Design a protein around this ligand. Sequence first.
Ligand code: BCB
Ligand code: BCB
Ligand code: BCB
Ligand SMILES: C/C=C1/c2cc3[nH]c4c(c3C)C(=O)[C@H](C(=O)OC)c4c3nc(cc4[nH]c(cc(n2)[C@@H]1C)c(C(C)=O)c4C)[C@@H](C)[C@@H]3CCC(=O)OC/C=C(\C)CCC[C@@H](C)CCC[C@H](C)CCCC(C)C
Ligand SMILES: C/C=C1/c2cc3[nH]c4c(c3C)C(=O)[C@H](C(=O)OC)c4c3nc(cc4[nH]c(cc(n2)[C@@H]1C)c(C(C)=O)c4C)[C@@H](C)[C@@H]3CCC(=O)OC/C=C(\C)CCC[C@H](C)CCC[C@H](C)CCCC(C)C
Ligand SMILES: CC(C)=CCC/C(C)=C/CC/C(C)=C\CC/C(C)=C/CC/C(C)=C/CC/C(C)=C/CC/C(C)=C/CC/C(C)=C/CC/C(C)=C/CC1=C(C)C(=O)c2ccccc2C1=O
Ligand code: HEC
Ligand code: HEC
Ligand code: HEC
Ligand code: HEC
Ligand SMILES: CC(C)=CCC/C(C)=C/C=C/C(C)=C/C=C/C(C)=C/C=C\C=C(C)\C=C\C=C(/C)CC/C=C(\C)CCCC(C)C
Ligand SMILES: CCCCCCCCCCCC[N+](C)(C)[O-]
Ligand SMILES: CCCCCCCCCCCC[N+](C)(C)[O-]
Ligand SMILES: [Fe+2]
Lengths: 258, 332, 273, 323
Amino acid sequence: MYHGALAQHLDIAQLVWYAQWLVIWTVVLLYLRREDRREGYPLVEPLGLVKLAPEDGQVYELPYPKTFVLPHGGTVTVPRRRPETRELKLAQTDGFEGAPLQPTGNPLVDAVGPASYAERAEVVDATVDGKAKIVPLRVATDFSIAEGDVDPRGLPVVAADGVEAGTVTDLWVDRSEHYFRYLELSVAGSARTALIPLGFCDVKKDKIVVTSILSEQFANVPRLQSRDQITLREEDKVSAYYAGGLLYATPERAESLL
Amino acid sequence: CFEPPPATTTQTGFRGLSMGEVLHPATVKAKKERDAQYPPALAAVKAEGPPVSQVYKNVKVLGNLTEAEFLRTMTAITEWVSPQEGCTYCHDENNLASEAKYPYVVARRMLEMTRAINTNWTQHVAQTGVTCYTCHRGTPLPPYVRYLEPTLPLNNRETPTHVERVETRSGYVVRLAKYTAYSALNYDPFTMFLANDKRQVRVVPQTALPLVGVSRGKERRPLSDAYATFALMMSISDSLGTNCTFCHNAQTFESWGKKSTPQRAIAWWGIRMVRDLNMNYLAPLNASLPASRLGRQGEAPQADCRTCHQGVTKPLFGASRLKDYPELGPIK
Amino acid sequence: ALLSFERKYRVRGGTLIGGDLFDFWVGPYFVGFFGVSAIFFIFLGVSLIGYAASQGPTWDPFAISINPPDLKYGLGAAPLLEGGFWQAITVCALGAFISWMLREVEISRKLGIGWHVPLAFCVPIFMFCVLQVFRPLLLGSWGHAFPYGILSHLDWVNNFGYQYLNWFYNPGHMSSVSFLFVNAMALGLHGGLILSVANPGDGDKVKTAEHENQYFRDVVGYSIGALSIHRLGLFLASNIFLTGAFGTIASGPFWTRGWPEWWGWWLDIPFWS
Amino acid sequence: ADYQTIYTQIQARGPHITVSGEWGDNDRVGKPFYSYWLGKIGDAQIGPIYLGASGIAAFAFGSTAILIILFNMAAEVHFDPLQFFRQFFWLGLYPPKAQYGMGIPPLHDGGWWLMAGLFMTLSLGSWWIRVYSRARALGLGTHIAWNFAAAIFFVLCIGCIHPTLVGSWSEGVPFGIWPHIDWLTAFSIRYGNFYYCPWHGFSIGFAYGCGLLFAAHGATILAVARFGGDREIEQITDRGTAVERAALFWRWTIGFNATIESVHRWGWFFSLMVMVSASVGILLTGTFVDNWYLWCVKHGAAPDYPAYLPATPDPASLPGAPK
Ligand code: BCB
Ligand code: BCB
Ligand code: BCB
Ligand SMILES: C/C=C1/c2cc3[nH]c4c(c3C)C(=O)[C@H](C(=O)OC)c4c3nc(cc4[nH]c(cc(n2)[C@@H]1C)c(C(C)=O)c4C)[C@@H](C)[C@@H]3CCC(=O)OC/C=C(\C)CCC[C@@H](C)CCC[C@H](C)CCCC(C)C
Ligand SMILES: C/C=C1/c2cc3[nH]c4c(c3C)C(=O)[C@H](C(=O)OC)c4c3nc(cc4[nH]c(cc(n2)[C@@H]1C)c(C(C)=O)c4C)[C@@H](C)[C@@H]3CCC(=O)OC/C=C(\C)CCC[C@H](C)CCC[C@H](C)CCCC(C)C
Ligand SMILES: CC(C)=CCC/C(C)=C/CC/C(C)=C\CC/C(C)=C/CC/C(C)=C/CC/C(C)=C/CC/C(C)=C/CC/C(C)=C/CC/C(C)=C/CC1=C(C)C(=O)c2ccccc2C1=O
Ligand code: HEC
Ligand code: HEC
Ligand code: HEC
Ligand code: HEC
Ligand SMILES: CC(C)=CCC/C(C)=C/C=C/C(C)=C/C=C/C(C)=C/C=C\C=C(C)\C=C\C=C(/C)CC/C=C(\C)CCCC(C)C
Ligand SMILES: CCCCCCCCCCCC[N+](C)(C)[O-]
Ligand SMILES: CCCCCCCCCCCC[N+](C)(C)[O-]
Ligand SMILES: [Fe+2]
């Protein structure tokens, strides 16, 4: 006789094989794939002819809402209905449903395509003890540049067109993570500063090179409401502006590479 | 520590199974050259006269040979075993029937053993056969022999370092490792498997589910048996200068039929042949050998696969003298 | 059919080749020229597989196997049924993988994000080439490559390993395995940390960037930081194959013995022999 | 290129932060120090470290286990130092070689191995408490401890539980570099080829999948680092363009997508399942399956191939074959 033999050529291991698959598909479809839908759902459609009710399917695919209670007050519940009311300066290139849209105006200023930001909260991200998290070193006075690294303050910023666009006057540090996230520059011949995320900066000994946008386009980098603070949505606006340059800084950037 | 391409590869299984030999051409060449030193057959002589059973005084094994034939054998033997020492290695030069020197009596036993291999172990040696040279390679002490503990260097013509010396306890793990293709397997497959027929090499179950009655507690073989078998198989591989897929489809090591090559069955017979030689011919020689020949347990040196094969899948790349020296078997 | 935030991102542009011609979506999928070529190769490769499999003895999915040619065919074309199908499928596989990789670049460009994912995806494509192209070329025969069968490809890995007596002693494999193990541990640690911070339980408040750093500083004395754990994970994972590739390529073209013996370079230093 | 995703161009230094726990704050020992070269690819601060009872307990048990192993290894080269260092990889502390069933083996044949395994186990338990406690002390969920628990359970399966289930200490994993590796082959050989164990297959799939997922997730967060995608907690509570773009990269590529929270659940789950699948495979092996290849043949799954060289009958089964 055999250990594990159940009968017909049923044996224990054979049954556990089925159970194993079942457990995996259950967790994957009924749990994980519904956790995947806590943002962006329900899917939207141009000009829904009529919907007296959401499809049953739109109810079935969603998890029950969860509520985060935020560290500095308030709550957030997901999923939740978040239409984007904001007008998009885009036009259909064709009537076909999967056709690409295209900017009717200045995509960088209009914030469309790779220049889009998200509707983040207009709140200043905070440290664990309640202070503004991302602040200029003019303010974060006990923070410094590590010995060995370029101090960019004073250095020219050179834009994609090789033209100098301004002068770095400060660095903004993440006081929660001890990590620089933006440079601030005086924009040449304008009377404004602009932040630029450090990821768009090639930091050299004698200059900061920025290939995402041309010198002219620094004029229109999003402006902050305060000089020494920045909100989560502003961070999105500023970052997105340069990202948009990667596709839109010149006419030829959107066309085929090769 | 690397070997430059090209590699010589063969196929020993259905395409896409990655079965076959992987050989470094320079190593094969070096072995071919070593093995090419096999002396050629002495010229044939005409069988004239009485059997030396009449002619000579103390001929026990080869008595049916004529004088010319017999002296040809003695000349061949001297060349294979004791070329540097000459006839007197075994003979009193004033009495050729004298059994006074131990190599004489050992040699008589070796004529019997050799005729036994060629007559009774054709399953293994087929029509290639063995001569004294296959093991001895021109010295009285064969280069690759085994005691009841692992010894180093494998080739005893090489001089041991102090750590290699069997007395040096701290060198034990390396003496074992170099017998099992450098693995760390903590088992000596010679004394476990090849010195006698006490142990079963097969460890893998032949049923899908565990049979009630052999599958729990002390009913079970210890897992150590599976290590030991792997150790034997590392050793067999290194001894023949080959890899597992020369014999097995690793899909199922325990299966035969399509899952095993013809060489695996020849290897099975080799295990039985080696055990016979050891139990019945070589181990008893400790009664006849000087103490200087014996191991630390009073064991005579005995044989494993390497004793003949010396790193080649066929000893001496399949060279044969079987037709040249019928005296040595097969004996009808 | 669009995520609620998706429409603003769906602009023209970003292609490597083709421009406006294939710059559109089918459902959620971006197409592009490389979507067209991916589909072409998948369709071909999958047709060849079906045809080959139909010519064989089985329709059990565990048992079907499409195998390379015998060694004797060297690096030449084999008859369809005896290796030729395998050779064709390998070409469609490479074509599909590389198209998939280049399609990812076009998607990255359109979104204004880095090309890190298609780059990371080159590593598995490279390893496929090591097994199927480079090592067979070095050994002089397509017949050294692995078969296409769910279980049969395991039998090839098995025999390949045992051709070198004990593959576990292969130094490139030791490195490969170590990265596989660290990477799996690290992914559980990284995923667990982020979940533990966003989901403290009861009605406790979501925690902070500072808590993440504090947790690992407490438990092991070092926190690598939030951006850096992602760089590390990409590094650990990639080096599973980048280091493994050396151990694979070495076996045969640069080492013909068992792998345990290779360590003779150490064991047999005469100083301590 | 975004150079930040390669290394930190300008490092910041600032006052060192401490997040207070519900207990144990006074058990943080050490002064932070900063490595500039470390700071190029990670946070530059090393230390302080938390001490605590469970951590200290872990070190005590672990060290004992290690001393039993090292002493037994030293005995193996007969306390020759140079040979010890030479042969270290090859040296090991082994389970019983003889079959004692579940009998406590003699010290010389598995007794020390058993002792070292016990202390290792207490070591792993103490550390799990530390991993669990620190999360609770800092007001965090316990997801890490639950992932760690599955890994510990796997070690118990191969070290202790499987030997107990078949009734033999001889089946445990030796301590040693090459020796613990040789076990993998011996165990697979004994049980008819682990390639044919479905739970070995599941484990591998999840382990390869961890490789896939961390390469994909790591690369995805570096690709959107320009938008602050690394700040994953606030991207969870307030979706930003970083993870909108990340989600859309994947939706456009493979047709479906995760969120920035849920991709960490996928990662955590894949990681867990490497160890869960492995354990189940080990628990079935020997208990209920003796030869995994034959089990697959029994259930019709195994592939078969033509003979290339002649099919070779077992000589042992031949008429008149010796034993
Ligand atoms: C008996 C033999 C053994 C063996 C033999 C072996 C060999 C011979 C090799 C490895 C290799 C490797 N082994 Mg080892 N191994 C490993 C782990 C590993 C891996 C880390 C590593 C790389 C695997 C690989 O090449 O994937 C390859 C995966 C690829 C190429 C994936 C390509 C994906 C592709 C780009 C896209 C595919 C798309 C699909 C077609 C699309 C599907 C569409 C659907 C989903 C919509 C572990 C953890 C263990 C343990 C614990 O026992 C182990 C034991 C053993 N290995 C045995 C000792 N192993 C390799 C190595 O690196 O060695 C140094 C190697 O060559
Ligand atoms: C050098 C070592 C190798 C190796 C060793 C290996 C082992 C030892 C094992 C596997 C296993 C598996 N392997 Mg193999 N492997 C596979 C695919 C597979 C799957 C059948 C399975 C689970 C893989 C997994 O989850 O990964 C992670 C990926 C995930 C989670 C994403 C989903 C991928 C999807 C399941 C792939 C499905 C593939 C389709 C069956 C392929 C054909 C589809 C086409 C026709 C449309 C591919 C597609 C390739 C290619 C293209 O190179 C490959 C190469 C290799 N594998 C190397 C040759 N692989 C396991 C198995 O169970 O085999 C039966 C297993 O035990
Ligand atoms: C010839 C032998 C084979 C073999 C035999 C084998 C066995 C016998 C086992 C595996 C297992 C496994 N194998 Mg297989 N294998 C694998 C891959 C894998 C893994 C997925 C999985 C082990 C899980 C793991 O992460 O352990 C690494 C993770 C560990 C050990 C967890 C540690 C956690 C712990 C808390 C850490 C504690 C550390 C402390 C500091 C210690 C302190 C020290 C002390 C002294 C104080 C691949 C990818 C391949 C390929 C490519 O061929 C392969 C081939 C083969 N394996 C061969 C067929 N493999 C296992 C399995 O899944 O079986 C179902 C298994 O048991
Ligand atoms: C699929 C998921 C997996 C997974 C998961 C997870 N893995 C985790 C966690 C999760 C989630 C944790 O939470 C926990 C952790 O905390 O992480 C930071 C942990 C860990 N995974 C480790 C090792 C690891 N994971 C492996 C595998 C997998 N992990 C798989 C892949 C492997 C493999 C692959 O072999 C290894 C080796 C440790 C680093 C750590 C435990 C430490 C311990 O338990 O220590 C216990 C304590 C000791 C042994 C004491 C040590 C004493 C030493 C220093 C010696 C001192 C001697 C002395 C100096 C002598 C004095 C002499 C005197 C005279 C002067
Ligand atoms: C070290 C880093 C690793 C790593 C990394 C990354 N991995 C990525 C990415 C990154 C970064 C992606 O961006 C890309 C992706 O989009 O993710 C969602 C991807 C992907 N990784 C897949 C499978 C996968 N990754 C593996 C391993 C690792 N990944 C390692 C660990 C393994 C194994 C076995 O380990 C598998 C099977 C697909 C799901 C997906 C490709 C889809 C494709 O290419 O579509 C195009 C092609 C098809 C849909 C079908 C093509 C069919 C051909 C023509 C005919 C069949 C031929 C075939 C050879 C038959 C084999 C039979 C078999 C039984 C022997
Ligand atoms: C003969 C024949 C078959 C012919 C036809 C072939 C065919 C398929 C035709 C379709 C024709 C159509 C419809 C269209 C043309 C357009 C086109 C090119 C379509 C492609 C169709 C196609 C080939 C689909 C296959 C897709 C594919 C390769 C899927 C694999 C999915 C798998 C298994 C992934 C493994 C990894 C995994 C488990 C992921 C789950 C978790 C996820 C989703 C992680 C991704 C992800 C990560 C990693 C983040 O870090 C992240 C961070 C923040 C937010 C989001 C994310 C996020 O989503
Ligand atoms: C030991 C390895 C030997 C060497 C070298 C040589 N001989 Fe030998 N010889 C040996 C044995 C065991 C025997 C007995 C054979 C048997 O069938 O029992 C012999 C016998 C002879 C004899 C016969 C003497 C007699 O009994 O009357 C002769 C004539 C003889 N051997 C000659 C001889 C010569 C000339 C050798 C070198 C060329 C020589 N032997 C070497 C063992 C060994
Ligand atoms: C391997 C299978 C052998 C074959 C074939 C022959 N011999 Fe041998 N011989 C072998 C061993 C393992 C030993 C024991 C170790 C030792 O050297 O004693 C021997 C020994 C001898 C001796 C004695 C050597 C000595 O101690 O001085 C002699 C003289 C001898 N063998 C002779 C001999 C002859 C004549 C053979 C062919 C007929 C022959 N041997 C074959 C292994 C093997
Ligand atoms: C032919 C020259 C072989 C080589 C090379 C290897 N193996 Fe082998 N193996 C061979 C035989 C003749 C036998 C049976 C022995 C007997 O007395 O019946 C075996 C057996 C095994 C086994 C046991 C199978 C069982 O039924 O339990 C295993 C696990 C095994 N061999 C493994 C193995 C490996 C891993 C090898 C390379 C290191 C290897 N073998 C080589 C013959 C030959
Ligand atoms: C000398 C007395 C031997 C010993 C000891 C062992 N083998 Fe042998 N083997 C010997 C001969 C003369 C031959 C050639 C036979 C022939 O067919 O030509 C062989 C051959 C093999 C083979 C066949 C190789 C092939 O066909 O390519 C194998 C696989 C083999 N031998 C294995 C083997 C093993 C594993 C042994 C120790 C247990 C062993 N042999 C000992 C002579 C001798
Ligand atoms: C029921 C009964 C009676 C008892 C049951 C008790 C029980 C729970 C038993 C469990 C046994 C277990 C868990 C066994 C586990 C074995 C396993 C998984 C072992 C695995 C691998 C071990 C390996 C690789 C470790 C090798 C050890 C070493 C190389 C020594 C390490 C030493 C150091 C590096 C020294 C560090 C300090 C130095 C630098 C100064
Ligand atoms: C594995 C068995 C446990 C061994 C003892 C480990 C010490 C326990 C320490 C408990 C600490 C409690 N605390 C502070 C977290 O509440
Ligand atoms: C061998 C381990 C297999 C793990 C399972 C793989 C999970 C892939 C999930 C994709 C499911 C997608 N979708 C949209 C259908 O839900
Ligand atoms: Fe993350």
